[PDB]
Amino acid sequence: ISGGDAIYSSTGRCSLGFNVRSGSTYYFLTAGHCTDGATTWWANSARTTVLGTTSGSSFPNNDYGIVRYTNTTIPKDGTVGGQDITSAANATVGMAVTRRGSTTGTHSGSVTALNATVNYGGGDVVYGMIRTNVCAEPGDSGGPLYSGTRAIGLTSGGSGNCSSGGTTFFQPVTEALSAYGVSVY
Amino acid sequence: VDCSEYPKPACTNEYRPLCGSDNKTYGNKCNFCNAVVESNGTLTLSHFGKC
């Protein structure tokens, strides 16, 4: 399973962001809003293939969570679809980036602004977000934003859609990596 | 679902679909409710889940 692939919780479907690890312990990052109140994750809508259980969840304010793998056999590719990821990097204005998610597949665009505040309502405000012109639609949450072999962010939310064009905000991945002490591979 | 606190300028992208009266499946409540506002309260909920 890789970055961009579907993940199911008890409540709905999100996208796996990146496969990360710490020592010999494998995990995957995804959106905090997806990990919030979820315990177990599965790889299929039937919930037959277990992935693992949530280990951390940071939403609102930030928007990242991490899930610890408990499935021993499922392959944990350090890629995004077939694309290799070798390091993580800070977003910059004008950077060309690509997103992959489980509903829309792969779409490209560029970083338009940094440190943006997105107010999802009811007190769910997230800060420090990367703004881009990439579209995203329901199901795409927590998928990767990358640039070449560099990991950059996790899909959070936005407006518009892929038919008409839209704006998507992403959580900087470096922050998540640092909070959990894990690294891409 | 109450769409009173809408519209919202942004929605998260998790998937928990609802079926609108226009027979379109909306990916999530926030997407749904913004469509309701956009139709000027003409769109209603048919049922939960995909259409």
Curated annotation (Swiss-Prot), chain A:
GO cellular component, one term: extracellular region
Record keywords: Disulfide bond, Hydrolase, Protease, Serine protease, Signal, Zymogen
Cysteine pairs bridged by disulfides in the record: 14-34, 135-162
Residues at the catalytic site: 33, 63, 141
EC number(s) reported in the record: 3.4.21.81
An individual GO BP term: proteolysis
Catalytic activity: Hydrolysis of proteins with trypsin-like specificity
Gene Ontology MF terms: serine-type endopeptidase activity
Subunit structure: Monomer.
Family of this protein: Belongs to the peptidase S1 family.
Protein role: Has a primary specificity for large aliphatic or aromatic amino acids.
Name listed for the protein in its UniProt record: Streptogrisin-B
Native species: Streptomyces griseus
Record lineage: Bacteria, Bacillati, Actinomycetota, Actinomycetes, Kitasatosporales
Gene name as annotated: sprB
Residues of the full protein shown: 115 to 299 of 299
UniProtKB/Swiss-Prot annotation, chain B:
Compartment(s) where it occurs, according to its Swiss-Prot or TrEMBL record: Secreted
Glycosylation site positions: 40
Domain of life the protein comes from: Eukaryota
Predominant location: secreted
Residues of the signal peptide: none
GO molecular function: molecular function inhibitor activity; serine-type endopeptidase inhibitor activity
Kazal-like domain ranges (all copies): 1-51
Swiss-Prot/TrEMBL site (Reactive bond 3 for chymotrypsin, elastase, proteases A and B, and subtilisin) positions: 13-14
UniProt keyword list: Disulfide bond, Glycoprotein, Protease inhibitor, Repeat, Secreted, Serine protease inhibitor
Intrachain disulfide bonds: 3-33, 11-30, 19-51
An example Gene Ontology CC term for this record: extracellular region
Domain notes for this protein: Avian ovomucoid consists of three homologous, tandem Kazal family inhibitory domains.
Descriptive protein name: Ovomucoid
